[PDB]
């Protein structure tokens, strides 16, 4: 439940972290609802909060969990990498560039199927 001190929140606790067949491998948590970026780009006070288009969510890594083995961020639906040896080098990323007939470039777009950070890059 969400309190006056705490937002509405949901956790993930391991059942069998002791003995008797404690299974552990790198699991991937996605939420259930997407956010949608607007069709065209732009190119508290009640004024600013009713006009703002920028949003915040939050995770908190508990004690006893290493941020070295925690990855937090964003994922688009066409992502199906299920591996236990995942590091940030193992992320698909394709850079598309286009130019004129002169060869001078016009744009350099990078599509990735994953937009995350490393928690080990802060602690």
């Amino acid at each position: 439940d969400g309190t006056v001190d705490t937002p509405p929140c949901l956790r993930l606790a391991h059942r069998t972290w002791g003995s008797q067949n404690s299974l552990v491998e790198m699991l991937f948590l996605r939420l259930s609802l997407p956010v949608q970026f607007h069709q065209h780009f732009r190119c508290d006070d009640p004024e600013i909060i009713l006009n703002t288009t920028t949003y915040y969510y939050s995770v908190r890594v508990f004690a006893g969990q290493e941020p070295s083995c925690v990855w937090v961020g964003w994922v688009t639906p066409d992502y199906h990498q299920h591996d236990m040896n995942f590091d940030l080098s193992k992320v698909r990323a394709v850079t598309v560039t286009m130019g004129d007939e002169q060869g001078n470039v016009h744009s350099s777009l990078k599509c990735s199927n994953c937009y995350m950070v490393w928690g080990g890059d802060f602690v």
Partner: protein, 420 residues
Amino acid sequence: LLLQTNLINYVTSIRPNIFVGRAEGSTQYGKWYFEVMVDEVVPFLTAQATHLRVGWALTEGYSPYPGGGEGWGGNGVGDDLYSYGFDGLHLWTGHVARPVTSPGQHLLAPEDVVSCCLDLSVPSISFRINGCPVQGVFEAFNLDGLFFPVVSFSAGVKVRFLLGGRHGEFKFLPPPGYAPCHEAVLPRERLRLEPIKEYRREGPRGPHLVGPSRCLSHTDFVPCPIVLPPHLERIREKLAENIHELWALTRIEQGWTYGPVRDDNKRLHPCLVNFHSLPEPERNYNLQMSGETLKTLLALGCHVGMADEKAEDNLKKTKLPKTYMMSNGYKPAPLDLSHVRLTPAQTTLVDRLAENGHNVWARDRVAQGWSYSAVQDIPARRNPRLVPYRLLDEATKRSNRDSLCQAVRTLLGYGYNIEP
């Protein structure tokens, strides 16, 4: 908020058996080329537009399935992060169209020839259609796996492959640095056309079901590679004189004689008299090839010991008849190994040595700046055996094997035993 229904078309994907990838130990080129000529496309057979794209794809990631999938459906080349598509006027990658600026841009009409410029050194894919290049390229993609050409088509499409001059005929000249695509065929398998990751295969009796295909890995193309005891130090030149005498018997059996020059067309052998009659670079070569195959013989775990030097010395040479003596009249006398029979443990160990020796040789050849092709281009650094040993065909695999079977039983005829 609700569900939507629609009729859509089926897509498939086809490829040749041309899996090019790069790594640290790279026996491959890394810059290729091929052409596709389209000659018969109905634009609208169905209610939906006739799907037809051409590009490149990875092995381990691109898995097109005949229904469903990512997007609205009919997903094929460029429909995720594992392949990169072109249709005539869009760059398909990551399931999004990208509008291009091509001169005279249109779809893949009939009587059109498209080309795919590929680079593995820099991550780069380019295209030209009917000789005319496109104004857009791909960059910075991953390199964990191999690459093969893909064309995804809907129904109502007839198209032909232009792979290389032995199979197709290139309607345009490749840009300099781009090998014709019929060169990366492996020696074990001929060129063939196939679908990808399939499960149904229509059989005689009726529709066969197959399991998952076993893909060649990324690093299946990199080859692989101490002190020496004094009891093997003296026998090293003994087998070296045995090897040259066995070579000159092999030379004289086909028609090489002892000549001052080395002419194979005239059948001349300057090492046809004796091992001491071999020149000092060949005399040093016979010893350094002896020390290499012995330091690796202990390295695999085969224990060696010295015993029965009397019965080894009591074994005479192989009998050389008047037909065995060459035109010089000096027939070499190698050590007789008719008494020694090789074990299946030794028949296992004789393959592991020739696997190492061939792959450590190509390791020196890969350091020499050489890469594989099916054709043999010596100034263009192509040797048709520049693969690891299990990728080598059986003929050259047997050829180094019968080469190394000579040194085993003569060293067993020298009294030395081999543990497994």
